[PDB]
């Protein structure tokens, strides 16, 4: 959720995460999850950046500019990933940055 | 004179020679070689894309999945999904399904 400089409040959706099983005992134990994230970035322009991802093409979007509408394809960066209780704990506290 | 005696007995290879430090003399750190480093964040950074709705809700209010469906319902022009960049080590049709 964010507030524009114009004052408008807004709710944003970047994608989805699918949590696996999570019988986390030790603080290093892993939850597997899948992250499905929108993007306009073409992965082929920098394929070494996306070793772990499987990038899909899922739609097309009409985008405003100054005085012209552009047609861009919509990608979905998909990957399996993991985290732990200790890493989640420290992510929850990232405001101290 | 126990310390002085043994200090006379000890080899003069046991020493701490001061080598003066000039940062004009010294070299740059060696960075390794190998395949390129991949992205490893838990979520996309600069490559992220948002679907959003205008919403007076505050910085953590509303049912997440209800909010999510509201954001999805702003975008049409979805497509039949196709793989445009494989996860070389993965069964990519699982990601598609």
């Amino acid at each position: 959720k964010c507030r524009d400089t114009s004052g408008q409040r807004r709710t944003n959706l970047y994608g989805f995460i699918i949590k696996g099983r999570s019988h986390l005992r030790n603080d290093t134990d892993v939850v597997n999850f899948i992250s499905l994230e929108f993007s306009l970035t073409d992965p082929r322009n920098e394929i070494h950046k996306w070793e772990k991802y499987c990038v899909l093409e899922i739609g097309d979007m009409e985008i405003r500019t100054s005085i012209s509408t552009i047609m861009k394809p919509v990608y979905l960066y998909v990957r399996t990933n993991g985290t732990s209780k200790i890493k989640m704990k420290w992510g929850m506290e990232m405001r101290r940055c | 004179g126990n310390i002085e005696a043994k200090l006379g007995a000890m080899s003069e290879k046991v020493n701490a020679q001061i080598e003066s430090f000039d940062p004009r003399t010294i070299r740059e750190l060696e960075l390794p070689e190998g395949k390129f480093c991949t992205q490893r964040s838990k979520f996309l950074l600069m490559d992220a894309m948002k679907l959003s709705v205008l919403n007076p809700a505050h910085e953590g209010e509303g049912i997440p999945m209800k909010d999510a469906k509201a954001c999805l319902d702003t975008f049409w022009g979805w497509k039949k999904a196709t793989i445009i960049k494989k996860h070389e080590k993965g069964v990519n049709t699982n990601y598609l399904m």
Binding site: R64, I70, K72 | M49, K50, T74
Partner: peptide, 10 residues
């Protein structure tokens, strides 16, 4: 630039 790839106007 021309548009925002993170906050596209659609």
């Amino acid at each position: 630039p021309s548009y925002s790839p993170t906050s596209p106007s659609y």
